[PDB]
Design a protein around this nucleic acid. Structure first.
Ligand SMILES: [Mg+2]
Ligand SMILES: [Mg+2]
Ligand SMILES: [Mg+2]
Ligand SMILES: [Mg+2]
Ligand SMILES: [Mg+2]
Ligand SMILES: [Mg+2]
Ligand SMILES: [Mg+2]
Ligand SMILES: [Mg+2]
Ligand SMILES: [Mg+2]
Ligand SMILES: [Mg+2]
Ligand SMILES: [Mg+2]
Ligand SMILES: [Mg+2]
Ligand SMILES: [Mg+2]
Ligand SMILES: [Mg+2]
Ligand SMILES: [Mg+2]
Ligand SMILES: [Mg+2]
Ligand SMILES: [Mg+2]
Ligand SMILES: [Mg+2]
Ligand SMILES: [Mg+2]
Ligand SMILES: [Mg+2]
Ligand SMILES: [Mg+2]
Ligand SMILES: [Mg+2]
Ligand SMILES: [Mg+2]
Ligand SMILES: [Mg+2]
Ligand SMILES: [Mg+2]
Ligand SMILES: [Mg+2]
Ligand SMILES: [Mg+2]
Ligand SMILES: [Mg+2]
Ligand SMILES: [Mg+2]
Ligand SMILES: [Mg+2]
Ligand SMILES: [Mg+2]
Ligand SMILES: [Mg+2]
Ligand SMILES: [Mg+2]
Ligand SMILES: [Mg+2]
Ligand SMILES: [Mg+2]
Ligand SMILES: [Mg+2]
Ligand SMILES: [Mg+2]
Ligand SMILES: [Mg+2]
Ligand SMILES: [Mg+2]
Ligand SMILES: [Mg+2]
Ligand SMILES: [Mg+2]
Ligand SMILES: [Mg+2]
Ligand SMILES: [Mg+2]
Ligand SMILES: [Mg+2]
Ligand SMILES: [Mg+2]
Ligand SMILES: [Mg+2]
Ligand SMILES: [Mg+2]
Ligand SMILES: [Mg+2]
Ligand SMILES: [Mg+2]
Ligand SMILES: [Mg+2]
Ligand SMILES: [Mg+2]
Ligand SMILES: [Mg+2]
Ligand SMILES: [Mg+2]
Ligand SMILES: [Mg+2]
Ligand SMILES: [Mg+2]
Ligand SMILES: [Mg+2]
Ligand SMILES: [Mg+2]
Ligand SMILES: [Mg+2]
Ligand SMILES: [Mg+2]
Ligand SMILES: [Mg+2]
Ligand SMILES: [Mg+2]
Ligand SMILES: [Mg+2]
Ligand SMILES: [Mg+2]
Ligand SMILES: [Mg+2]
Ligand SMILES: [Mg+2]
Ligand SMILES: [Mg+2]
Ligand SMILES: [Mg+2]
Ligand SMILES: [Mg+2]
Ligand SMILES: [Mg+2]
Ligand SMILES: [Mg+2]
Lengths: 83, 99, 104
RNA sequence: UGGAGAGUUUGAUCCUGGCUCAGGGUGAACGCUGGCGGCGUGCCUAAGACAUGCAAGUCGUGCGGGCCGCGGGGUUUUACUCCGUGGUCAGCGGCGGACGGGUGAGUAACGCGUGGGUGACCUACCCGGAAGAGGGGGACAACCCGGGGAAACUCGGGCUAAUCCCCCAUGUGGACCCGCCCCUUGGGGUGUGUCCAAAGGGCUUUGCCCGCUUCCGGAUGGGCCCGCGUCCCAUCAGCUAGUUGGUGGGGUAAUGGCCCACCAAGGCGACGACGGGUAGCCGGUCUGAGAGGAUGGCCGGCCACAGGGGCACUGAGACACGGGCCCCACUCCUACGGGAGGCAGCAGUUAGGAAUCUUCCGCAAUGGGCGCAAGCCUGACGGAGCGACGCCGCUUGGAGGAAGAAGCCCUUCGGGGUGUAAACUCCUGAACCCGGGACGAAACCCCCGACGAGGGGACUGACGGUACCGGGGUAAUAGCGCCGGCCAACUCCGUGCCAGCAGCCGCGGUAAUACGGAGGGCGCGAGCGUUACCCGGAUUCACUGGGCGUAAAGGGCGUGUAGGCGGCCUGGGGCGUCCCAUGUGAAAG
């Protein structure tokens, strides 16, 4: 099914993931359906994680299944927070 | 060597014979109805047609016919039978055709 | 949108099918001058309603056969073999240009 | 914000004109040379052949067993026999094996690009919604018994479970025929008739979880069709009979001669059919002032292929690289009857070649498959290795030091050069030593809380004792090409049309700035040259941006077909053309 997962975009020893919505079957770095965020594991800048909850929620509402790390990040940005 | 994908193969043959079988029946009963109808025997033709209809749907119950493949057979069947009966018939047993 | 084209009926010698010669104009990709290029479409005619010289609109359709993926929409204006003539002569002119002799 | 020209045809001149150089680029290769590091990149040839290991499995929460344990019962005791539990093996059953990874052989094509069409369609797993799962029956492995074979394995006989197969029921609904209605190419609704459902499992058991069934829809992925665009040869001009169309049928998820029977006689071509050559296409890449030329490695998208040819089965999906069948070539085993194979997966071997790497580390991260989960599997991938192959960073020292050492070197022998270069003085301190030492990892999980939101906790690093930080600390690789003009840089000597240079002009037949060496010099420097190839300069195919009296170029002349082109006024249309809005123009670049 369609997923919300991380696509690798940094450089050697300089990982920079790109949180994308893609079909489960594509290369992890292949053609995605939509970019809905980014994530710098090493937090090299204050802005090491953006998400756009609006969109993350649209895909979740239509099927998109996030990987474990994907939701960990989506949650950290309050995608599932309902308070 | 030796990869247990051999299993999928075994499995496919059981499936093959199973599908192959159901279809044989379908075609056999279909031709059967198309025959009695062609001979104007409305009563027992519709009788058999119903069996053919039934077998077709059941075949599409699992992965033997499925989709709209079943629907064509049925259509083509009800069509030929009803037309062939247009040679003095009157849908006697009033099987699956709707007056 | 299903492409709609307008052309002339050059062939009629076919059952439930007519040939529509469609022209188009465009600037040459390198030399600029506007040039006319044409193409024949085999269009569907279930009622054999159109004849030679009929300028008809053709619409993109669901395949009717190999070659036939267009149906005749409507008639734009009829009778006019001046258009059929160009095609015919240009067709007959093919006798001269070859290896064998021909009173083209 | 963008455009430089030069040498070379003559005694000399102008022009024409070709050749050649200066620039930039490359999956490079070769020669001489070679210190460190980051990031990229590396069979371009025989799509030659491949040893070996690894490259796809996973579920005991679908099912029954076999072998090996441990333990508990029936019993007064034995035999016998009942239950529980651990490991293990395959089997049945399911999901995955149609992805991910490889290569461009084929293909000049709706293959690809771009814009559209599908009332001609499909889509497992995921999401939303509606309805539901009542009863009965059956078989085949495993296992057991026997038979044929060297083996691969194959034949028969018996028993058995299930989310395995079948029947009956319920029919939300849906399928099909006929009718009617709305739409209008097979879209939606409706009525009668007929036809079609289901699977069970798990417990933090008498509910909740995982799952099952039919249907409507979403999302994603995909099939098919159409306009336009996509190389060379016309010393390839005619091509075609499934051919073109029709009717009926078959087939498919679906249109279609897709396939078949029958009928019609068509269809295509100079706006280049057919035939031959070559070639995977694109985003882009290189070059160019631009127009354009060349190109398609790496990365991303599409296609195609998996020893060559054909074929279909199973599946939501394959005509299926590590599935099946047959033919062919080949390797291998052989008890010769007959069998086993297919690295264009990673790595590696061998062959070919001018030439292209480690039979490495890890699944810690991201991604994928299966599982409730634990977790298992992932040569996808993340890393390290080798190669100046490319790009960037960096070092081989810093400051002082004679009107100037030695040697070499030229010399009008007086001096001139190498040279502040060296020596030497002082300063710093690449290497290397010692110490500390990461980010990448927080989730899954478990506890609280509703298996939710939210809060809390624990486990987890291949790279790696690496990066980086701090202390200590030695002056410690230099090379290559060139110096007649173009083209930055000149002298001596040897040689004597020889030996040899040479990109183009051209050098050498005894005073050679052009050969060879030397001193000196220029250029670049961990590289410098060479060869090859692409674009430029080259307005040297000229669309931008050229020509044809005598330089290459007017057809020997005419007639005329297609085609190209077309006077003045008005009106309609609005195709070309122009304008506004809007959609599209993936990411990377
Ligand atoms: Mg039969
Ligand atoms: Mg010249
Ligand atoms: Mg002359
Ligand atoms: Mg001269
Ligand atoms: Mg060396
Ligand atoms: Mg490297
Ligand atoms: Mg190759
Ligand atoms: Mg092997
Ligand atoms: Mg492995
Ligand atoms: Mg015991
Ligand atoms: Mg097992
Ligand atoms: Mg692939
Ligand atoms: Mg060809
Ligand atoms: Mg196609
Ligand atoms: Mg559609
Ligand atoms: Mg869809
Ligand atoms: Mg649902
Ligand atoms: Mg049973
Ligand atoms: Mg038994
Ligand atoms: Mg036996
Ligand atoms: Mg038996
Ligand atoms: Mg029984
Ligand atoms: Mg029933
Ligand atoms: Mg009903
Ligand atoms: Mg309608
Ligand atoms: Mg209807
Ligand atoms: Mg109805
Ligand atoms: Mg239960
Ligand atoms: Mg003919
Ligand atoms: Mg037909
Ligand atoms: Mg059909
Ligand atoms: Mg015929
Ligand atoms: Mg051709
Ligand atoms: Mg090729
Ligand atoms: Mg450019
Ligand atoms: Mg130019
Ligand atoms: Mg360009
Ligand atoms: Mg291009
Ligand atoms: Mg390559
Ligand atoms: Mg690529
Ligand atoms: Mg495809
Ligand atoms: Mg091979
Ligand atoms: Mg099937
Ligand atoms: Mg293989
Ligand atoms: Mg060799
Ligand atoms: Mg992993
Ligand atoms: Mg994972
Ligand atoms: Mg000094
Ligand atoms: Mg884990
Ligand atoms: Mg609780
Ligand atoms: Mg939490
Ligand atoms: Mg020193
Ligand atoms: Mg020179
Ligand atoms: Mg000079
Ligand atoms: Mg000599
Ligand atoms: Mg001399
Ligand atoms: Mg001389
Ligand atoms: Mg000299
Ligand atoms: Mg040019
Ligand atoms: Mg000229
Ligand atoms: Mg002349
Ligand atoms: Mg003349
Ligand atoms: Mg002549
Ligand atoms: Mg005019
Ligand atoms: Mg005109
Ligand atoms: Mg006008
Ligand atoms: Mg217009
Ligand atoms: Mg526009
Ligand atoms: Mg846009
Ligand atoms: Mg872009």
């Amino acid at each position: 099914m369609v997923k919300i997962r991380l696509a690798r975009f940094g450089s050697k020893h300089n990982p920079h993931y790109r949180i994308v919505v893609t079909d489960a079957r594509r290369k992890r770095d292949g053609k995605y359906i939509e970019k809905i965020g980014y994530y710098d594991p090493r937090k090299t800048t204050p802005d090491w994680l953006k998400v756009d909850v609006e969109r993350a929620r649209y895909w979740l509402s239509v099927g998109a299944q996030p990987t474990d790390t994907a939701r960990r990040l989506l949650r950290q940005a309050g995608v599932f927070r309902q308070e | 060597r030796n990869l247990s994908a051999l299993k999928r193969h075994r499995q496919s043959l059981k499936r093959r014979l199973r599908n192959k079988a159901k279809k044989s029946a379908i075609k056999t009963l279909s031709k059967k109805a198309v025959q009695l109808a062609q001979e104007g025997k409305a009563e027992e033709a519709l009788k058999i047609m119903r069996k053919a209809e039934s077998l077709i749907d059941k075949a599409a119950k699992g992965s033997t016919l499925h989709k709209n493949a079943a629907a064509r057979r049925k259509s083509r069947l009800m069509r030929k039978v009803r037309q062939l009966l247009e040679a003095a018939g009157a849908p006697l047993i009033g099987g699956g055709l709707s007056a | 949108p299903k492409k709609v084209l307008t052309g002339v009926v050059v062939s009629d010698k076919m059952q439930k099918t007519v040939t529509v010669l469609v022209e188009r104009q465009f600037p040459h990709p390198l030399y600029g001058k506007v040039i006319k290029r044409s193409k024949k479409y085999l269009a569907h005619d279930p009622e054999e309603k159109y004849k030679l010289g009929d300028v008809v609109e053709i619409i993109e359709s669901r395949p009717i056969s190999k070659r036939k993926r267009f149906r005749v929409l409507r008639l734009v204006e009829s009778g006019r073999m001046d258009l059929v003539e160009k095609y015919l002569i240009r067709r007959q002119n093919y006798q001269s240009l070859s290896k064998r002799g021909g009173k083209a």
